[PDB]
Amino acid sequence: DPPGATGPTTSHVVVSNPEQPNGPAQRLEMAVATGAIQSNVPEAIRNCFAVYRTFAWNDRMPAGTFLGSVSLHPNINPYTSHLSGMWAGWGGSFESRVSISGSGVFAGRVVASVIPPGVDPSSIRDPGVLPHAFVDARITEPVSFMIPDVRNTDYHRMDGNEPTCSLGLWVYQPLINPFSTSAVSTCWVSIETKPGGDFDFCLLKPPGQRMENGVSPEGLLPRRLGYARGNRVGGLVVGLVLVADHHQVNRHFNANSITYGWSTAPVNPMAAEIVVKHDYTNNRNAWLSIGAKNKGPLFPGLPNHFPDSCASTLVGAMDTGRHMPATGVCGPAIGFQDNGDVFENETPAVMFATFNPLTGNPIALYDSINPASLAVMCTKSNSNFDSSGFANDKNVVVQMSWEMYTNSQQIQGRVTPMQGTNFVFTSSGANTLALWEERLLSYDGHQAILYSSQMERTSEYFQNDNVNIPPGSMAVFNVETNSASFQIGIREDGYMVTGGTIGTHVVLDPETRFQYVGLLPLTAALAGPN
Amino acid sequence: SIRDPGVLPHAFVDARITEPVSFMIPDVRNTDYHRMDGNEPTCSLGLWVYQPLINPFSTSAVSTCWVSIETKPGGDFDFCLLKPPGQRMENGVSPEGLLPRRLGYARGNRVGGLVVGLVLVADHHQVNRHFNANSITYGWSTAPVNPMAAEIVVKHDYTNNRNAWLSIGAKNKGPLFPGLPNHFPDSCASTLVGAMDTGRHMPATGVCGPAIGFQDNGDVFENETPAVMFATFNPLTGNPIALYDSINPASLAVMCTKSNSNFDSSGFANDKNVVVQMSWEMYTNSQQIQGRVTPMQGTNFVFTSSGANTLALWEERLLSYDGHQAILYSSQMERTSEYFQNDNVNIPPGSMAVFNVETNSASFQIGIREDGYMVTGGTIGTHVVLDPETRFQYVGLLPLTAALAGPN
Amino acid sequence: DPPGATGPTTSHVVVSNPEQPNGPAQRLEMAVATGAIQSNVPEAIRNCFAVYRTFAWNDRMPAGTFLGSVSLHPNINPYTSHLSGMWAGWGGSFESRVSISGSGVFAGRVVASVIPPGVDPSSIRDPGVLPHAFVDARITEPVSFMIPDVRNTDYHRMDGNEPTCSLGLWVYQPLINPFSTSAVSTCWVSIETKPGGDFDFCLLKPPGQRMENGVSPEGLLPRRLGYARGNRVGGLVVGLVLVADHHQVNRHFNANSITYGWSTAPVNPMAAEIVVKHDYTNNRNAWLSIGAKNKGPLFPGLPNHFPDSCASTLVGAMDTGRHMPATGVCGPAIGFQDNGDVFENETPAVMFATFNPLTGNPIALYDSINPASLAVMCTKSNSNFDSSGFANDKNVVVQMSWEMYTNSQQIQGRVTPMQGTNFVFTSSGANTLALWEERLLSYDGHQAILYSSQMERTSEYFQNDNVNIPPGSMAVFNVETNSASFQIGIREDGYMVTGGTIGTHVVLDPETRFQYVGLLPLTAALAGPN
Amino acid sequence: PEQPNGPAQRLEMAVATGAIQSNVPEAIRNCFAVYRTFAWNDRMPAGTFLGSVSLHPNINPYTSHLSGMWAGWGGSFESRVSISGSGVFAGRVVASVIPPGVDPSSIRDPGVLPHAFVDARITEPVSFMIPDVRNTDYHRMDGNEPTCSLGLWVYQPLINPFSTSAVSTCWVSIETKPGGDFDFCLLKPPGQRMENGVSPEGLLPRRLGYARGNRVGGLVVGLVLVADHHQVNRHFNANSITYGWS
Amino acid sequence: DPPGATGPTTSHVVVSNPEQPNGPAQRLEMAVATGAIQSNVPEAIRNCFAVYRTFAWNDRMPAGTFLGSVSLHPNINPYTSHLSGMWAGWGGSFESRVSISGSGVFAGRVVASVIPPGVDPS
């Protein structure tokens, strides 16, 4: 090869640690444990590299700055991640060439070290203490590193949530430019990846067979954002917020496919029965009591798709204006019989609310959601429900279409709980709980935004399968917007986590792309916004 | 299509056979390899009844035997050319993703109602949200069904003859036809569907839903949300304004269902907007909008089955204004429309993508054309009822002259 | 060779993919099928590289920026492209050396990868997954790549739009200049091409012979713009726009030489006959109903070369000013007799319009173009058409010169349709419908511009031959302007579609050079302006 | 001036199909049979396309008969062209062999191709070889692949020197052999309909007779020429689709 | 072959009459008279059996019930019947395998006899 060009298969292996495991003896261990004597990877994959990451390296990053890591897993090669779906086991080292795109005028060194399993690359504070290699910024040939397979077992389960080795990159000596420019001179560290040598697969399962502890969390987020919808109302996802705590329990599902609420993950309009019809008053509007005849899918008594963004005492108290609760979620109400005979004449605008059943006294808001407390109230101040279509032996289906404030208080992070219910969801440290911004219609010229715990396809994917997110770690995704690229971690609680200050807003266009990285532990610091 | 199976060079297999019998399926090909794109014919292995199955035990019941087929890659089989995994190739994606693995809560492309089953119809005209294998539509709507956002052009007050209504048109902001708003129904009220009656003072048959007025900044008029029928009217009338034959961008309208009410003065002004859903269907006759599609002006799209294969439609489920079941016949379902819309699908113009359909009782075959339309054997008028446990299985590409095992 | 100079034949072949076809065995297969035992290519061409493209590579282009592809075809060597007019088939590989105009101070890499046939190079989302080679910007010796011929068949048809291999170039690590300045430091990637080895031609056709599915799309656009005219009026083409939708049907021809309008592709002046003469009124000027005696060459009744940019209700309402329609394209009218006794005295300034016969009542405007609606008014206030000169048994012909507005609305993307005529033309994704900014003579001191669907030499070229644009593809043209450089794709509908923001204006001087890249599919993303 | 390797294209077919042996009787390879006769008038100017003979089994009546049993073919035919006209007439006809992928009715320079002048005064016929230049290893019997052709054009117009105002017609005949390396590939049952349809030979009868149109069913008189038409009754596509009700 | 499956070309020739003509000597006589020295039949047809008839055989048919005759003609192979539109003469023997769709519980025999020319089988 000429000195400016670099073909495939070309590797200059630098041994960054004189404690490599016996590769072929681990290959013997796999062949004893599974009978995997023959190789399962085509040599077209074993010979050529494939691009995995590229990392920025500025003047303005000091020594010891973590550039990025490459964790050992079959998903860091696209061909190996494709081939892994037919197999129940894997094991073996990878090979990884690093190219640094810096001129011969720069200066600066990168520490590249292989990390033992069970030690987090982002949490290492002293990177030159580990046995490490240096890579100069002036380097021309790409430098290859073996990422060894240090494993307790004879093979890794494809299920297996065990720690593997990583390859970390840190700034050893900062990047400088002799040309005194006030602007930032940027260098690019690209990482490519082979299956190296002793890598093989173990145990034929049929392709796409769901294994024991879940599916891969790659399908939690879309490939690009598009017209994604959140799990509270189904409004359009606008961006992200960083909040301290949150209480969202409707349509929130764990990695164990368990919810704590009463609704199903694809959002539908609320079908419900009419229990007691109420006429309008000089004080308060005409309203209607709601309850299924023990036909709720999760809580029999709570109808499917009742909003937790309804009107309550926790959200906003009633005002002597519109003669109704101030803040809540509204939509039109369609009455229909048991055979589906829709009352087609009127379709009154309607607010979701929880009321105190014990009142009578003018009936006021309740703190929480009780199956005997569910109600819908007219928005029109002096109208009345119709006599035959909204009778006590009828049904109603209501959508969640817009939001009304009648104050300066929205229902952004606010969730109406149930009785005897205290679900709190908190971020620990150097990682913040993140929520999606739904987009409602509003009763004013301002933007109506609710903060939802996850989006609809994340809720359906958690709902329908078990997702292999173990309780110690997160499924981490890269997020590329037009300007900001950052990381999001999804827990096994179903909640989101990313770095930054509580209150940080991100705006996500529908060209926002997500990329599944892998499982990083909860103690890892995610590169957040700003 | 082979009518004489013992004329081909063939093997016999007895019904009394104990060992399984292996056959090589050869690769007779013109080319040096098959493209993974490639829609070229390969060899097949057919099975025909040579001598009929008999039981010496004289039972009136049917004695059934099972012929199971297993498959290796045999010998000289190999793959050729590394593309990256999941790379879309030249003439499309595989049509495996046209239908779901199990039915579930699937929705059709006309209103978005629940898919109940299949019908066999002679012809159909459905052009909204229908996309080809070439990812081309002929209509004006986008494949995920959304509520119709539209402008208010002219507000009309109620009359002793006819209800209060409202004229519709986007300011050249339609995604496909600028002038036709996204998600206007082709199941609207028209002269082709049902003429007006001097009962409800409105068109008889159509699709209705509530109407939400809102401003340009999104300021929703939250007070009233009147029930509303989608209709196309003749703009030239005035004379009491009556139904039109087709859909013209100056003909679009929505009319109150309530017989003597009136649109509000400020929320439904001429500088406002409205968003309406398609929630239920009204008849006011014995004529539904099952296979009926309101066309456009100068538009004649006909979709016909040829022979020994019948055009098939999905049965949507609407809410109804009565105690009967409201069913519209839609050309495809929503995820089929989105999958045709977003990718090119490798269905060549001579063939079909064939699927096995397992319900509780009936298992049959469905062929999807490159037109996006469905095809299966049987008599015109055959109804199938599909529970949400109905499973689909992609078989492959069979030509249009193939006879699909239909229902019954 | 001295280390700074490179002669011909000098190549350092870098292998990017270790799976080349058996070159001399495919050459034997071509000779069995066609009898091409000996070489049909002169050996002066096989020994020397000749230039094909030159790609600009900047600081301001990120990683994964597609620089360009070299698709395998005879038109990528200038000698082989000339020879391919004689031959009906070909087969074999080309050899491609790449030279980068980078100093020794710069840094940056490009990915060179050979792409399998059937895969669009401009649809590859991760460029480095395939087996690739890295070429550095600081390289001195040029690097040679073999572009293999992976093919099902024994040879390629010179017609056949069957896919061949490509050599795509992407930016891997961006180009950086350490001498930091806001100015863009441009690098030049120049690609040269040999016929490599097993390349040959197959079957003699006569030179310049149109083959079965059309001529090449090279002659659609000129080599350089010049004084080019559009097909709406025939005015000077100023530049481009990017419009969402358009309706231009007149003189527009498909790749199958099929038109949907009523005119012929070189714009002649509008030969027309006079049906009913009309005098001037105090409210509106004099006018003249137009209709031939069923002598339109496409729609007999619509006259040859009647404008679509006439005055209509969609264009502009009539004002109580000059007693005529506000916005239209005007011209001087010439009245002549059937044998050639042209009327010499008067020549009225005459605006094109469309009116209503059913009115009777002052006759007003009309929405569309009906063969009874064809009518033109004066520009003067109280003049009148002469008795013998402009009678009911005479003719009239008008040369379109003006463009009047009389409001703030123009006829830019506006086309007047026919009755029973709703044609739309729309792009779908990563690509925007482009149009040609025409030029007329404004009635003001502003610039009077129409947007036309295609130009005359594109309309004439689609007429006289069929053009090899298959229905799933585009014909892509490089646009070498003074400042900008981008791509324009022409469809089989005859419409221009390119990348960029809807509404982007481009100024095209007559030194704008158009250069033909090959055929790309409709789903391909085009590098548009800015 | 390039012919394919005849017996080595035959090795490609025996690999791709298993057709190692011959399937055409050798009495057909020795007998020219009249395929088609073209009328050639005074009233056709220079450059008039007379008709092309595309390479297929249907251009020999013995080979079109044999091809009902076979799903594939490949190989060259041998053709000769003869004129039946008086020795007084003046006019040439170019007959040129056309490479595959070129439309014969789009060729504007027939005398540049490998050609032959077939004058009206000719006595012996002009023999041609029509090669099988193909990308593939065989041809599908139903497949509409590009083949080599044999076009005919009026190079010089046919004129009658005597004072005769009537139209004088000349007759161009084409005879055909299967040449040499021609063979068949894949047994289908005899008369088996292949995938994309039957041949269009059976659209019109061998002679008109008492034929009936599809609007009412009256006796067919002859043709007309109309610009546009709307007939939808009893009109069926090649895809066997009608839009009417009868 | 496995004992339940039968491919093409599989034949167990049972002789019903031990007075066959000299087959290859009659083939030489045909080539003197007509010049048919080489084979006019493709060898794909000579190797495989193709179906001609199917005869129902019941409990309710007594002994001596005529099931059917296979008279020697080109129209008793479907490929040879198609080829015989090209030819004005023929000669030679055909080979006929017979398969009976009987279970192992049934019983019954058929007579197969080759009949001299000039004698009606019925």
Numbering used by the authors:
A (entry chain C), C (entry chain B): 21 to 380, 385 to 554
B (entry chain C): 143 to 380, 385 to 554
D (entry chain A): 38 to 283
E (entry chain B): 21 to 142
The authors write:
Sapovirus (SaV) belongs to the *Caliciviridae* family and is well known to cause acute gastroenteritis in humans as well as animals. The major capsid protein VP1 is solely responsible for most capsid-related functions, such as assembly, host interactions, and immunogenicity. The calicivirus virions have a mostly conserved capsid shell, which is composed of 180 copies of VP1 arranged in a T=3 icosahedral symmetry. Each VP1 capsid monomer contains two principal domains, shell (S) and protrusion (P) domains, with an N-terminal arm located inside the capsid shell.
